[PDB]
């Protein structure tokens, strides 16, 4: 139907905007601490601690399959990256501190993304 095509076009345009948001958030992680999944070979207990692991590569795979239907879903995955790290790692660590800085800098980006999503529809 044409209505289905129009819905598909809207999902495609959201995907474009989320790809630009993702790029901008990932630039706030210049150490690449959050680029890839925590390796269970290197951290064999991880899934005892963290029940829903997340990282920027995993988000990019979901995005490219148009698997984010709205900005809330995207933000949920970004918050998992941060919140997982801040639980597993202590305050005194470069990992925790990178997560704080990514959260603080990412908030700015997400605040304007929300306005664009609402504005454009």
Curated annotation (Swiss-Prot):
Disulfide bonds: none annotated. It comes from the Eukaryota. Highly expressed in testis. The gene is BRD1. The chain holds residues 555 to 674 of 1058 of the full protein. This is Bromodomain-containing protein 1. Scaffold subunit of various histone acetyltransferase (HAT) complexes, such as the MOZ/MORF and HBO1 complexes, that acts as a regulator of hematopoiesis. Plays a key role in HBO1 complex by directing KAT7/HBO1 specificity towards histone H3 'Lys-14' acetylation (H3K14ac), thereby promoting erythroid differentiation. Component of some HBO1 complex composed of KAT7/HBO1, MEAF6, ING4 and BRD1/BRPF2. Component of the MOZ/MORF complex composed at least of ING5, KAT6A, KAT6B, MEAF6 and one of BRPF1, BRD1/BRPF2 and BRPF3. Interacts (via PHD-type zinc finger domain) with unmodified histone H3. Interacts (via PWWP domain) with dimethylated and trimethylated 'Lys-79' on histone H3. There is a cross-link at residue 41 (Glycyl lysine isopeptide (Lys-Gly) (interchain with G-Cter in SUMO2)). Residues 9-113 form the Bromo domain. It is found in: Nucleus; Chromosome.
